[PDB]
């Protein structure tokens, strides 16, 4: 019943005291955070409190969309020796700091995601050459489907790959994806290995990567410029915004204190120093 | 008029959408549908139909009749496997081309119990008992009867009832497994071993063969459609 938008408990008036009750004392040893209120130690007047936690509820903490990647595509001239670059990005929040740290506060979570795609383009060669408005395709290849090979092979016939066709110069594109985990919650951390090295086998085939699980494998996104070759080369970038919605979490962990290094929890040398200098005696 | 505002996504063609649109042939009289016998409602039903697994895909035997015939014999009793098979209903070449397999190539996560049925095809006079086993994954794949033995298995017995069915119960960590070759979500191993030996009287073919069938049980289901790797149009 107590919703997020409820007023915090009104602080009671309390006067002088000389009793055997000891509020003030604890023994953090138990592990219990001593639960005192202002009125417990000092004298308080009555106060009708109006502040509510409404803007810090799990929902609101993740309520902002966030950049997750920068995918590069381009459409060079047909005369060019280099091949028309189509980008393929594996879907993982771990590619950028920002969302990851916000997600790390929790061991597990269930969240239906909403993706937004802002696509910006530009010329490269200093030619007063033109280019007609381009049309992009963002194809979601789920784990195991054939990943595109050429900017123009069959794979793009999207028989079943849910795709999006975005014309440039229009409002950014957006799609909703429900919770797609193979579990009951997405694992932000996986302690263990996929393969158990067996006693009657080669170490090679018995070896995997620590903290690498399928739990967080979700296929790739394929992006290409649909318009064919154009005399004047035009590169473009596709920024992907992810905003977790209908979110819920489990088990708090301490926030990441030193610069992240790679997909694991691992850290690099030099970066292991977070706090600064300050004196024990200077306020 | 009515003040509105175009939000993110206006003009984005989603191949997977579900919006109404205009009609290109107003008032067309749709021809009424008859009752054609045999209407399918869901892909899973097709998956519940038995299909012969091509167990032997050896160099010479692949892509030729010999692929669906597992050859047993009247040799003396040994503790060696007759046939091995990774329970990867979509990634293992052996399962990959069966009906249950083919439907799986259009999904990302399969789930539920799978069943293996074997049909003996030798003489009426020949008899025996073969052990069909299912070991959940995570240990050395069984190589000697002994070990297969320890896991989930059914000891068949050849007779007047020509076919034996083994159910492979859904025992797995996740709640659906990756339809691809993945360790984390691996499936296990199925194996067949001579429990006794196949005995034949005199003047009877000494080497008869078996046929295998796979299919889904009532609790099987799949999800998240994807395109298939089982076809390609070059150019």
């Amino acid at each position, epitope marked *: 019943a107590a919703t997020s938008r409820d007023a915090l408990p009104n602080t009671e008036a309390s006067g002088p005291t000389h009793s055997k009750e000891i509020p003030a004392l604890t023994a953090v040893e138990t592990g219990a955070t001593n639960p005192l209120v202002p009125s417990d130690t000092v004298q308080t007047r009555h106060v009708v409190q109006h502040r509510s936690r409404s803007e810090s509820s799990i929902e609101s903490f993740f309520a902002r969309g966030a950049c997750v990647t920068i995918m590069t595509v381009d459409n060079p001239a047909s005369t060019t020796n280099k091949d028309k670059l189509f980008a393929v990005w594996k879907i993982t929040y771990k590619d950028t700091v920002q969302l990851r740290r916000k997600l790390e506060f929790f061991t597990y979570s269930r969240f239906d995601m909403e993706l937004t795609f802002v696509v910006t383009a530009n010329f490269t060669e200093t030619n007063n050459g033109h280019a007609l408005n381009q049309v992009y395709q963002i194809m979601y290849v789920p784990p195991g489907a054939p990943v595109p090979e050429k900017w123009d092979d069959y794979t793009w016939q999207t028989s079943s790959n849910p795709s999006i066709f975005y014309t440039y110069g229009t409002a950014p594109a957006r799609i909703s994806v429900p919770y797609v985990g193979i579990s009951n919650a997405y694992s932000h951390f996986y302690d263990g290995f*996929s393969k158990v090295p067996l006693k009657d086998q080669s170490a*090679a085939l018995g*070896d*995997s990567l620590y903290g690498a*699980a399928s739990l967080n494998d979700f296929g790739i996104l394929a992006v290409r410029v649909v318009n064919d070759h154009n005399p004047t080369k035009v590169t473009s970038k596709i920024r992907v915004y992810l905003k977790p919605k209908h979110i819920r979490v489990w088990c708090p962990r301490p926030p990441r204190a030193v610069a992240y290094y790679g*997909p694991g929890v691992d850290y690099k040398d030099g970066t292991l120093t977070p706090l600064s200098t300050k004196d024990l005696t200077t306020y | 008029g009515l003040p509105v505002m175009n939000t993110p996504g206006s003009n984005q063609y989603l191949t997977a959408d579900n919006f109404q649109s205009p009609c290109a042939l107003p008032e067309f009289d749709v021809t009424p549908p008859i009752d054609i016998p045999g209407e399918v409602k869901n892909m899973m039903e097709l998956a519940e139909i038995d299909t012969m697994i091509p167990f032997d895909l050896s160099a010479t035997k692949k892509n030729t009749m010999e692929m669906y015939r597992v050859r047993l014999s009247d040799k003396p009793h040994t503790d060696d496997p007759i046939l091995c098979l990774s329970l990867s209903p979509a990634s293992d070449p052996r399962l990959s081309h069966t009906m249950l397999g083919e439907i799986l190539n259009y999904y990302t996560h399969w789930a539920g119990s799978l069943k293996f049925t074997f049909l003996f095809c030798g003489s009426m006079m020949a008899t025996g008992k073969l052990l069909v086993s299912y070991a959940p994954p995570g240990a050395d794949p069984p190589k000697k009867r002994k070990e297969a033995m320890l896991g989930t298995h059914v000891i068949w017995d050849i007779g007047l009832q020509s076919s034996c069915t083994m159910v492979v119960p859904w025992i797995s960590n996740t709640t659906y497994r990756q339809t691809i070759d993945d360790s*984390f979500t691996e499936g296990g191993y199925i194996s067949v071993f001579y429990q006794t030996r196949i005995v034949v009287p005199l003047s009877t073919p000494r080497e008869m063969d078996i046929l295998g069938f796979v299919s889904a049980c009532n609790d099987f289901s799949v999800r998240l459609l994807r395109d298939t790797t089982h076809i390609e149009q070059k150019a």
Partner: nanobody
Amino acid sequence: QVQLQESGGGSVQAGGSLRLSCAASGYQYSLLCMAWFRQVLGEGREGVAFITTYNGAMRYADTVKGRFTVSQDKDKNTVYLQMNSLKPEDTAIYYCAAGRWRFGDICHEGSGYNYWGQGTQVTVSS
């Protein structure tokens, strides 16, 4: 298709040290399992050392192990092969193959390798 632009052979004598560079063209990220090889003149076409793109873990061939070290240029998509202690028998047409990957499984020889390199030959004179 992934392209593997290799570089750059030569027949220096015993104990030598050269190196091969091979690009991802290609989309080096989580996929490719950049491996090394050398075709022992018609004998002959063995796998040297192979690196994992995702983590940077190397494994070598029982032959090359130690002298040869596989290096990785993550950001500029190149995988090197510091060919050390080049002895006469380090004469063979070098290779650079790169397959895909198993999400978490280490890049080994029994694993890859889908795509092929140029095959730039390095010979060790005698």
